[PDB]
Write a protein that binds this ligand. Structure first.
Ligand SMILES: Nc1ncnc2c1ncn2[C@@H]1O[C@H](COP(=O)(O)OP(=O)(O)O)[C@@H](O)[C@H]1O
Ligand SMILES: Nc1ncnc2c1ncn2[C@@H]1O[C@H](COP(=O)(O)OP(=O)(O)O)[C@@H](O)[C@H]1O
Ligand SMILES: Nc1ncnc2c1ncn2[C@@H]1O[C@H](COP(=O)(O)OP(=O)(O)O)[C@@H](O)[C@H]1O
Ligand SMILES: Nc1ncnc2c1ncn2[C@@H]1O[C@H](COP(=O)(O)OP(=O)(O)O)[C@@H](O)[C@H]1O
Lengths: 135, 442, 442, 443, 436
């Protein structure tokens, strides 16, 4: 899922464009007051009509707990593998973002191109600012 | 050319402002049912009512499915038509109520029209022009982008926003490629490479779409035909998003979900808003269910609920049972396997069996469709065979007769070939007599 | 929209002393049932009490769902009306108790009052600062009217709103702070230099004058079920449309009830009760009745109206017969409205109203023949014959339905009793309960 | 002004200091022996020593079985947990009924815990990340440390973040000029809002403004929390709350019930025992109430036979209204109250008796008083003889159409003609059955 | 640990037997049932010997006659470190696992692997921590003065120990345990320094301790199956573990046993209310009882000549005859007056209830009249009725008041058969009205 790239495919093939994929594609960058975009923008219209971005939060969980720690006495390989699985840098970089001054240091000062960056910012947006935390 | 049990019928065959004639459009007999189906077709073309139900009943091999397909051909290809079997509603992913509602929403169509203002063709130049006073701490501040386009019998230089150059860089637009820019959104897309830049390298992967015809700038009016179920499954599923859930669900099995009534209400109100604007036309269609005795009483109850809706299309039901218990009930005796609550809500069209001359004419038309040549005495013996056993048995015994005629290096079916096909292939009655008169687990 | 079965009923047709007129708002007859429905309507409108079960019982084609539709029309907007059928409870994703709990909780509205700020001004300057990958976005917006000049700081969602349907420094837009809406009113600057793309052929509009920022109290209604679905997990707003809300836990509902009581105490939100209407309630298991018997005693419960057309029959899930197909525990805590069959004058007035709704002009003798057939057969058959007679009249090119059109529609389309007679006369042609059928006509 | 629904005129059992119940006090009329037995049961629950005790309220329909359980719940108060349930809730299409019964058993045992919190809070003054030596090495993140400057009242601190903390710092989208709240137990960060030291009205994102927090940046505070054992079970079954990968992906997936193993419950029991042994936690046994217990089948009863013999299970109250009814899931056995005899031998049965005419009259009088209505004495006597004629519930539910019909004639009192009109409009079960028997086409 | 309020079998601490497996009249909370207790002691010696496997024992008798009490006594006298899986008959009808798979998991939860290992630890009291840090955090230097009540030492610390001491912040005055191989540092608490609280450790700082692990076969089956992790041991979604990894575990366990690296302990699988199983469960048990890695299965039931579930015929004890051929049967008997009185006295001492003698005679009379469990349930209600009138000893009228308030089975059946017109029958007919 993480390193999925939209590579090109040749025309001489049996996989063609199903109609609902075409309806999904024509509304990717379409603006407002277009007929296909307005027929395809039901959920954001319901979001903006029902004033949902200023609503409060009524539920919080009672207990929050980390996963169960597995310990093996007398081995560092198990600790290294557990720390690799819990804090996988590819996934943890995918669920977050690089700071802007750091990105400026990579691209301009270090010569790294844009496409050579690790994929970031895949975390889904919360509904409100109030829904982003349990506190 | 493939023929399969049908396609010898081309509409009902009525004349205008009148009744059905005796033989027309591949139909022999059945005048009154054809007239009733024509009245139903005119009612559907009137495009006013909603949720009207027609049950056509009769014996086996009578022409109920042929009449439904004749209705579908008489309406045309732009009006939606959803064929269905009563056994298809039992799914192990979602409840049968949701499947019935999906098949209800599949039968209503929306015709939309739109205007597109495009600029397409091969790029001649691509120059991001710098500004007069660049800002400090930056690099190559752009005031506009000059793009020149070339197509068949027309070249034109453009003057663009500073913003689109980012999309040009992201879409990897070099010189010599063919691009496509719509007006209001920008959003340049790379449709391919020109064919004049094909043979400078021995090996490449990129395709070569040729130069597009017409001018570089033309406004085109397009017309698109969708259904309401397509809009429902497009609004219910998310669009192309950057979240991990959207990309994870796109690579997983597309499991069907219970679409809520809220999404349907929002879809109907935005569709009504754009219909009142004068852009969209609503085309109700036909939902056809064959062998409706397979439904149980829960689906019958939800049919009673859903036929009183505001948007529901014309439903055509077919059945061949008589006094039968409704499925899901142990002691309710009902005509055609349909409970009286649904029976009170529909109109019943009765279909009648045939006689010998109509059987002979039907066999003649099915022979002349399958590109076969039959002798007259063999035709009369086949008509007698159809009278004695079945119409469908006489119809299905034509291609073995043609093959056995071809095996003897002749092009005409004779009496000996139909006797050989009689002796080789059995019917239901003689097979039942064989089963009854044998005691070796036959 | 399209003409439905109950499209002619706009209200209940009651006086100020709850005395029903003989013909008002598309409803004729049924004086005591309409009086009781008006009493139920006043009890719902007061909103003081909760969890009262009302049962509507009678023969088929009497006006149960018509009465429920009249109650829903007289209920007005901003009061929820959850109308479901009995077979919708059984699902493969939710339990029966969870589906009934969601149906109960969909019928209670929370009216929430919010404060918002409206800004209407001419756009002067837009500065947007983004990161290299386009993730972190911030910026400034200098907006003006004829009297003041304000520089605002922008967030991510506001810049996302500005980037869609692009504003170009000289337009007139509208800003809602609580909703986050971007609405381009038009363009006032009328710039000469314009890039070949883009193009704001937005209608001309004057620059707004007066105060830039205005305060407004707005109000909006949500349901309790939407609050539980939103607070259930991370992406509940998608589950409001996809219906993927599987078995919400009880702790969520307790915390939502406590927070709703807190919002009532602080004066922010008020509670508006609604009506839950179960059509064909006899298609429910005994476990559903057992859950309803305890769910009707809670504070957050709506007025439940159930409809039954059944007499003494076997309760589903058990093996004994009960009055109206319902156990005596549910029949103890309910008050029953009884509907009665019609006369010829009421049937004639109903057919006149239905002919006026379908815009079909009828002759007097055709109306008398339709009244006679609706006295002999059911009312729904003679109601359904009107559109067929209109189509037959339009086939002969006269826009007035005469007697012979109704006679031809009677001959073409059959009743229930006539179809039963034709099946019983020709039982060998149809497949019986034992699967035996005689196809051959020899 | 207020809302009433079939209850809430009942406030408690209404007993003396010696447990002797009065004739009418606390919304109850009669039922002295059942109320005394329920008071003994309430005292037994408050004794907090017994585990797995079971009573069964046996009686007819409309005799006050649910009202006694609600009175028990209000007698215990909101401190002790109380779990109401219907017999049809145990059949789920996600998990088996045995696991649901175990879940509802564990949902009725509470715990009160005094918990310490290490907090870093204040206004962010500076936020400077420093970069790694090689960022595209594949192993290791892009940055190494982030320096944050927190300013509070009478204090200003500077912190060096772990990048794992910085991910949860960045995900709530904090910036310079923002008041934050970092909980050192789990690493969760709350963004309070913009500080009011700067400007206010120049925003466009409906934010709220908060002053500087009092006290120092680093704090240790004591929060008293109430919890159940089922909350700990579902927290450890689906781990969310940590800053690692699995707990981050657990918040985005669809929640689903699972069969929680016994080993997890024993580990949770050992941790809770360690907590109460330290003098931190306090255990509160509670009540699980199941109404319409006849809907349970033989498998749930057979698992209840095992589950009542555990050393954790709370006091369970049941209710039924069947005389000699065959048990569901079986084919021939007939047992009292729809409850099999092997479970009946472990219960304590409390009988509930029907009422007389005067009890029906004063119940109708109290219900009319609670619903804020004025009833004439002759109308009250007609309602009482109607309630004795048909049912108590029918006489109770006809009061509000009487109130509507009295309001619609511009009157406050309810009179005899109003009661006759409400009789004519609305029917009961007996008259409807008499209509059904002499009917034409299943009317 | 192991919090528990009061259970129904909490007064039983084991089988009361001598060295010749003879039952005492009253020992370890168990009275009566001499032959059944002797047979269960022989079964306990079978389990403790461990040289035989796959033996099925059926405990059958009347209800409320010491069956689950016998199982609890066997489980208590087994002690700790020996697996004991007590399930019910209705617990295997799952929605994500088949019945045979759930039975296989319940079978393999009762066989354990004993592995002894040695590890070295540094458990001590921190005197002083000195940390030298640079501006950029490149090189860190560390001194650690740490001690016991017996020694005292100073350690130079490397960079990763500096990082592991900064994380989970250790101050002076703390008592900590350090593992050198894995780098796990645990704060045991604070020492006795008034200036929680634990005692400063004694002896050598670097100790070497041997720990013994008992791992069930089901845990290794979950771990070795690569499709799911160890969290399925806690979340419960193991999900139809295949037989190939079971074959690999069965080979590797015998490979470890031959090399002497591990040992085999067998356990007891107890199935309470075994008559609720299906016929396909019995057909699986008939072949699963003949494995080498099979525990001893004890089944308890009280049915007599009932219908076997999944079939249409009747069988003794609800079990088919092929299963009953593979079992030996222990039979219980009903209790006398004296044993009922002794059981009620033991339950009186258990719940801290002070009883008069005449109240005990009344309880014994109403116990031999109605039930044992009814008198065992009245004894705590009568204490609350006693405490309502402010006296400690439960008297006769205190038992009589609880007898009046709370009914039993026979009186409820009598009252229901007297006033059946007010209840719902099988046909669903009730009368709610009082008049007419
Ligand atoms: N009026 C007709 N004219 C020509 N062919 C007919 C006619 N009625 C039926 N048939 C033929 O009979 C065959 C079977 O009839 P079918 O429509 O399947 O009847 P049913 O649907 O009642 O079983 C079809 O292949 C069709 O071509
Ligand atoms: N008073 C009335 N006003 C308008 N239409 C009526 C009236 N009474 C009956 N009808 C018609 O008769 C039918 C009644 O059936 P329905 O509404 O399903 O309720 P029920 O099943 O209880 O008779 C409806 O289709 C309605 O159009
Ligand atoms: N002693 C009483 N005093 C006042 N109201 C009562 C009394 N007993 C029963 N009721 C009322 O009778 C109704 C039926 O009682 P409930 O216990 O809920 O159902 P059931 O008795 O059928 O189990 C309840 O609404 C309750 O308010
Ligand atoms: N020999 C005994 N010693 C002590 N208590 C006993 C003895 N036999 C039975 N009991 C008590 O009798 C009750 C019923 O025992 P149990 O075996 O659980 O019932 P069942 O035989 O129905 O499984 C238990 O609570 C137990 O405490």
């Amino acid at each position: 899922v993480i390193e999925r790239t939209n590579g090109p495919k040749n025309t001489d093939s049996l996989s063609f464009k199903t109609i609902t994929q075409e309806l999904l594609e024509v509304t990717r960058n379409a603006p407002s007051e277009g007929v296909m975009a307005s027929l395809l923008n039901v959920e954001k219209h319901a979001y903006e009509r029902e004033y949902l971005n200023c609503i409060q939060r009524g539920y919080h969980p009672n207990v929050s707990a980390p996963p169960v720690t597995i310990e093996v006495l007398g081995s560092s390989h198990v600790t290294n593998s557990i720390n690799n699985e819990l804090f996988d840098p590819l996934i943890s970089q995918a669920l977050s973002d690089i700071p802007a001054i750091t990105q400026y240091n990579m691209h301009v000062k270090k010569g790294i191109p844009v496409e050579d960056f690790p994929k970031t910012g895949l975390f889904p947006e919360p509904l409100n600012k109030n829904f982003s935390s349990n506190i | 050319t493939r023929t399969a049990a049908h396609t010898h019928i081309k509409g009902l065959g009525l004349d205008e402002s009148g009744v059905a004639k005796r033989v027309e459009g591949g139909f022999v007999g059945q005048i009154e049912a054809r007239e009733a189906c024509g009245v139903i077709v005119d009612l559907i073309k009137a495009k006013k009512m909603s949720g009207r139900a027609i049950l056509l009943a009769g014996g086996p091999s009578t022409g109920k499915t042929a009449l439904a397909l004749a209705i579908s051909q008489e309406l045309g290809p732009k009006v939606p038509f959803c064929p269905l079997v009563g056994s298809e509603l039992y799914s192990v992913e979602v409840k049968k109520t949701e499947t019935l509602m999906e098949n209800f929403r599949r039968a209503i169509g929306l015709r939309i029209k739109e205007t597109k203002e495009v600029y397409e063709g091969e790029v001649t130049e691509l120059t991001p022009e710098d500004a007069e006073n660049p800002l400090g701490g930056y690099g190559k501040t752009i005031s506009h982008v000059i793009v020149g386009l070339k197509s068949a019998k027309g070249t034109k230089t453009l003057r663009l926003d500073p913003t689109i150059y980012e999309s040009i860089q992201r879409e990897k637009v070099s010189i010599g490629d063919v691009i496509y820019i719509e007006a209001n959104t920008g959003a340049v897309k790379r449709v391919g490479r020109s064919d004049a830049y094909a043979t400078e390298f021995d090996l490449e992967t990129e395709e070569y779409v040729p130069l597009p015809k017409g001018e570089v700038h033309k406004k085109k009016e397009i017309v698109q035909d969708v259904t309401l179920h397509d809009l429902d499954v497009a609004n219910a599923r998310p669009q192309g998003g950057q979240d991990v859930i959207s990309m994870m669900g796109q690579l997983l099995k597309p499991k069907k979900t219970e679409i809520t009534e809220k999404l349907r209400q929002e879809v109907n109100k935005v569709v009504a808003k754009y219909i009142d604007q004068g852009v969209a036309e609503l085309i109700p269609g036909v939902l056809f269910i064959d062998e409706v005795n397979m439904l149980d009483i829960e689906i019958f109850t939800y049919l009673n609920k859903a036929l009183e809706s505001n948007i529901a299309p014309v439903v055509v039901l077919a059945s061949n049972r008589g006094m039968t218990t409704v499925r899901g009930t142990e002691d309710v005796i009902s005509p055609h396997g349909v409970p009286p609550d649904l029976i009170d809500r529909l109109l019943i069209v009765r279909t009648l069996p045939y006689d010998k001359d109509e059987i002979r004419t039907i066999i003649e038309r099915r022979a002349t469709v399958e590109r076969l040549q039959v002798e007259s005495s063999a035709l009369d013996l086949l008509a007698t065979m159809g009278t004695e056993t079945s119409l469908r048995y006489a119809l299905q015994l034509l291609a073995p007769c043609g093959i056995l005629a071809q095996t003897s290096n002749r092009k005409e079916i004779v009496v000996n070939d139909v006797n050989e096909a009689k002796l080789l292939f059995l019917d239901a009655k003689r097979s039942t007599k064989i089963l009854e008169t044998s005691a070796n687990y036959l | 929209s399209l003409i439905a079965a109950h499209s002619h009923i706009t209200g209940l047709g009651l006086d100020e002393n709850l005395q029903p007129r003989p013909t008002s708002e598309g409803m004729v007859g049924q004086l005591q049932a309409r009086r009781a429905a008006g009493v139920i309507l006043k009890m719902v409108q007061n909103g003081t009490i909760a969890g009262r079960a009302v049962l509507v019982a009678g023969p088929p084609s009497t006006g149960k769902t018509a009465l429920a539709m009249g109650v829903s029309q007289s209920l007005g907007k901003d009061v929820p009306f959850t109308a479901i059928a009995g077979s919708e409870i059984f699902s493969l994703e939710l339990s029966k108790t969870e589906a009934l709990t969601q149906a109960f909780r969909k019928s209670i509205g929370i009216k929430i009052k919010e404060e918002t700020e409206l800004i209407e001004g001419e756009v002067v300057e837009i500065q947007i600062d983004r990161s290299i990958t386009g993730g972190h976005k911030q910026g400034k917006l200098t907006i003006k009217t004829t009297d003041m000049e304000t520089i605002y700081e922008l967030g991510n969602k506001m810049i996302d709103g500005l980037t869609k349907e692009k504003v170009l420094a000289g337009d007139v837009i509208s800003i809602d702070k609580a909703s986050g809406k971007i609405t381009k009113l038009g363009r006032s600057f009328a710039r000469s230099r314009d890039y070949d793309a883009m193009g704001a052929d937005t209608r001309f509009v004057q620059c707004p004058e007066g105060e830039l920022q205005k305060r407004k109290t707005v109000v909006h209604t949500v349901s309790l079920h939407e609050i539980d679905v939103i607070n259930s997990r991370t992406q509940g707003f998608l589950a409001l449309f996809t219906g993927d809300t599987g078995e919400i836990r009880s702790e969520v509902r307790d915390q939502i009830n406590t927070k709703v009581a807190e919002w009532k105490e602080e004066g922010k939100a008020e509670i508006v009760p609604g009506v839950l209407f179960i059509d064909e309630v006899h298609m429910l298991d005994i476990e559903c009745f057992s859950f309803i018997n305890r769910a009707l005693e809670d504070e957050f419960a709506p007025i439940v109206m159930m409809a039954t057309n059944r007499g003494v029959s076997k309760t589903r899930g058990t093996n004994y017969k009960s009055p109206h197909g319902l156990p005596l525990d549910l029949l103890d805590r309910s008050i029953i409205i009884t509907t009665k069959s019609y006369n010829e004058q009421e049937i004639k007035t109903i057919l006149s109203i239905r002919a006026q709704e379908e815009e079909v002009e009828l002759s007097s003798d055709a109306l008398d023949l339709l009244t006679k057939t609706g006295v002999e057969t059911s009312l729904r058959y003679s109601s359904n014959l009107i559109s067929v007679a209109q189509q037959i009249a339009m086939k002969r090119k006269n826009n007035t339905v005469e007697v012979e059109d109704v006679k031809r529609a009677y001959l073409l389309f059959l009743d229930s009793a006539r179809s039963v007679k034709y099946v019983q006369e020709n039982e060998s042609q149809y497949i019986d309960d034992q699967g035996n059928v005689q196809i051959s006509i020899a």
